[PDB]
Symmetry: C2
Subunit: 195 residues, 2 copies
C-alpha cells in the first residue's frame, strides 16, 4: 500500500532533494515552551499545571538533541520496543540507521513511538556531504546528557537521544567525549501535527 | 503502575472537579490552521505543502466535532482497532463510553490512536448536569458529516466523530436528525504536546 497514504512522499523530498521547496525549520521547543524539566514528587517533563507533556518534532519543527551512541542489537532483541509489532515498511533484520529517544518524545503507555520513522540530518564533514538519512526509532533511553556532559546526574534533564554505533561517527570530523559536540537535528517523518 | 506515570491525575481533575484550576480551552483547529481538506489526487487532510497532517486535541486545545452514533460491539469485534493490544487500564469487556474518530486525528500506520483515552464533555440538558466522562477510542470512521448534514458527499470533509449509542442520547433534550445539533467537545487525555 501507498505510504504515506496521502500527500507527497516527504521522505523523498529530504533524502533526494534536501528539503527543497519546503519551509526552513523552526525548533520543536517553540511548540511547547512550558514543557520543562520540573519536580512533582519525581523530576519529569511537566507543563505549568504539572501535567505530563511531550513533544512531536515534524518536518516543520525539528528537534535538536544531544546524542550518544548505542548498540541496536540488544535493543532490537530485548529493549523497550522489542515486543512492538513490525509496522508498515519496517525492514527485515537490523535497520541500516536506528535511534533511541527519551521521555521528552513519547508516552510509554499509549504513544510509544516504537518502530517509527525519523529523518536525521548528517551535516557536511571532511568525509560526508551534507545529507539526510531515514532511521527507525527502536529504543527508549534516559538521556541525562548534554553536548558538554555525558552525565547530568540521576535527576538531570532527559533531552538526549542515541544513534547507532555506525551512524554516530558520521557526525565527527577526522579531528569524541561520548556525546557529539553538536546537537543532532531530526524529526518524526510521519508526524505533522503543528502549524 | 501509576497512570499517568508523572504529574497530576488529569482525568480526576475533569471528572471530579470539572477542570478547576486549569486554563480555559482553546480550539485544536488553531494549532494547525493550514491542515485543511484538500485534493492531491484524492481528497485528504493535507497541509499547504501537500503533506498529510493530523491534529492532537489535548486538555488545553479541545476538539469540537460533529457527531453521529455507532454500535461499539461490531467495532470491538472486527473494526479498525480490533487487533490492537489492550493497553494499560483498558477495561474488560465493552467500555462504558466509546468513541470513533476520523483521519483528522490519526495516522493509520504509525499513530492509530486505537484504544486510547478521551475525555468528552456532556453539557447540561433537561436530564443531565454538565459533566465530563472518560471514553475509549475503539474505531475509526469516515466522518463526512456536519451538524447540518449527515452526508457531505463521497469526497466531503472528514471531521465527524461517532459516539456509542448509549452516550449519544445524553446530548439531547426531551425536545434527532442522526447528527447531534451541537458539536461535541472532547480531547485525548494522555496527549499534551502543544503549548
Amino acid at each position: 500500500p501507498r505510504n504515506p497514504e496521502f500527500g507527497i512522499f516527504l521522505n523523498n523530498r529530504y533524502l533526494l532533494h534536501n528539503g527543497e521547496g519546503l519551509p526552513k525549520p523552526k525548533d520543536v521547543k517553540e511548540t511547547y515552551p512550558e514543557c520543562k524539566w520540573r519536580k512533582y514528587g519525581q523530576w519529569a517533563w511537566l507543563d505549568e499545571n504539572n501535567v505530563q507533556c511531550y513533544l512531536g518534532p515534524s518536518y516543520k519543527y525539528h528537534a535538536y538533541s544531544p546524542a550518544k551512541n548505542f548498540d541496536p542489537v540488544p535493543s532490537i532483541q530485548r529493549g523497550a520496543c522489542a515486543d512492538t509489532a513490525n509496522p508498515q515498511d519496517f525492514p527485515q533484520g537490523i535497520p541500516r540507521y536506528t535511534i533511541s529517544v527519551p521521555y521528552l518524545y513519547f508516552n510509554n503507555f499509549y504513544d510509544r513511538r516504537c518502530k517509527v520513522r525519523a529523518l536525521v540530518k548528517v551535516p557536511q564533514t571532511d568525509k560526508e556531504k551534507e545529507h539526510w538519512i531515514q532511521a527507525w526509532v527502536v529504543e527508549h533511553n534516559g538521556g541525562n546528557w548534554s553536548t558538554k556532559s555525558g552525565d547530568l546526574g540521576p535527576n538531570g534533564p532527559q533531552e538526549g537521544i542515541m544513534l547507532d554505533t555506525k551512524l554516530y561517527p558520521k557526525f565527527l570530523n577526522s579531528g569524541d567525549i561520548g556525546v557529539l559536540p553538536n546537537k543532532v537535528e531530526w524529526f518524526f517523518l510521519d508526524i505533522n501535527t503543528i502549524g
